[PDB]
């Protein structure tokens, strides 16, 4: 089941993972609409793109890459929600279509 929302599981997350880091690496793949980072048990993030085609370009380009050398290995799958709900813009969540 394809989706415009991707789930990033960041293996060996040695460095700080923020919305600015994820926006930086994802938006060249395809336009990013929203980001939500979960920090409870490792680091997983949901990244919502403008379209399925952009999400598929992000998945094809980044799956199995390292954000930084030797760590932060990306496992990328389609997320369950088809849209993200964001109510605040900070280092953990951001909506690039809703400045607050």
């Amino acid at each position: 089941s394809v989706n415009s929302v991707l789930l990033f599981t960041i293996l060996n997350p040695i460095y700080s993972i923020t919305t600015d880091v994820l926006y930086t690496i994802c938006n060249p793949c395809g336009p990013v609409q929203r980001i939500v980072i979960f920090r409870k048990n490792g680091v997983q993030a949901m990244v919502e793109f403008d379209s399925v085609q952009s999400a598929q370009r992000a998945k094809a380009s980044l799956n199995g890459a390292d954000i930084y050398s030797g760590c932060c290995t990306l496992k990328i799958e389609y997320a369950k929600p088809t849209r993200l709900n964001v109510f605040k813009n900070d280092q953990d969540t951001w909506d690039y279509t809703n400045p607050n």
Partner: peptide, 26 residues
């Protein structure tokens, strides 16, 4: 985007994103 990145450390014929490094180290 940081010059030179994403950087392909090596090319693995089995896996196009193995060896790919998205950003320089903080």
């Amino acid at each position: 985007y940081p010059p030179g990145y994403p950087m392909q450390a090596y090319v693995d014929p089995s896996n196009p994103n193995a060896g790919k490094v998205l950003l320089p180290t903080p």
